[PDB]
């Protein structure tokens, strides 16, 4: 259970002494799903000091809260925070000195890389006053 932010390979504790971590087969039958979307937000008009490139961030809607967020309106959110990296996986090969903190983050137990950490945000419940 509990596939993490990159755990596309459940490879722990087989029943018999078979070849553990040898393969997998993502069954579309029993593994129940849920539906989501990824939208961007923006800061309200009555708080900007000047035209000073008003920054933003990104959210994730998880439950039934999909499609309740009509785009282009003043809106409120739940408030759980999160940080999500994704640089090393099975498929595709993974300016300034952005990600300079990442050099500290090296040398995990798997292969030596430069793993970053970017701030993001998760929601649970939406409301739209106005």
């Amino acid at each position: 259970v509990e596939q993490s932010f990159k755990y596309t390979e459940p490879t722990f504790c087989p029943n018999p002494s078979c070849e553990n971590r040898a393969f997998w087969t993502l069954n579309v039958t029993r593994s129940r799903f849920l539906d989501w979307q990824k939208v961007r937000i923006q800061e309200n008009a009555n708080e900007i000091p000047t035209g000073s490139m008003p920054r933003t961030l990104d959210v994730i809607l998880r439950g039934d809260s999909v499609e309740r967020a009509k785009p282009g309106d003043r809106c409120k959110f739940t408030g759980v925070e999160i940080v999500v990296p994704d640089v090393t996986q099975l498929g595709l090969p993974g300016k300034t000195t952005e990600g300079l903190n990442s050099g500290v983050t090296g040398l995990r137990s798997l292969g030596v890389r430069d793993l970053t950490y970017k701030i993001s945000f998760l929601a649970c419940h939406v409301i739209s006053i106005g």
Binding site: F5, F12, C13, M53, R55, L57, I82, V83, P85, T96, T97, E98, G99, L100, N101, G103, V104, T105, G106, L107, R108, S109, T116, Y117, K118, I119
Partner: protein, 243 residues
Amino acid sequence: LRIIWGTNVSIQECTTNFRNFLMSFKYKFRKILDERDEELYYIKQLNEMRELGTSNLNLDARNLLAYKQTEDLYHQLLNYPQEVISIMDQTIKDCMVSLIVDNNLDYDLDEIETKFYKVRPYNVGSCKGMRELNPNDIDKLINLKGLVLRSTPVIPDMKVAFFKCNVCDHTMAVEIDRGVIQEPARCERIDCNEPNSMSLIHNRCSFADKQVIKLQETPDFVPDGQTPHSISLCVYDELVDSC
């Protein structure tokens, strides 16, 4: 006094040499700016730190040049500028406690004596831009005059780590304090816990703030042919999104 492989700095004489200079000041500098002051700004302000509970002391730091002693401390600030602020953050906690030992009714000696205050030596020396920054300037104070251009939001930083392997309950929290994260190659928390899948729960250990800003100098009497170049910034304390 102690001796470091890196520096040559002393033991806490200069802290005490500051603390008598700090407390027994009441006026100085009347001679370098000779015009003709009954009590120092900092003397009232050091009382003013506790009664608001803030953590910042904006030190002018051109007082050691006015004082007769503490020149050695003054000319070690501009030559090992990481340990000297790392020393003075300990002293200002104790020099605040040097006021709480007089009046024991000052915030119960516990809770404001947990959050670490800090200092800010500003407007020291002089500098003239970018076409003088030699490679010898490795660890010094610099005084830039320019213009910032554009900012990115805050990304986090590894100030504390966390670990948990696949046993029942084992929630150790290792530190980093370097550019190097250290791991165990065999488990713990039980006798029969062999080398196994030590996992990295990332979204549990706390992080501070950090922000990089890009700067380009103003054309301040540039010789009318040279393109104004750029340099970046970096910040750690509670100054993010205040500039």
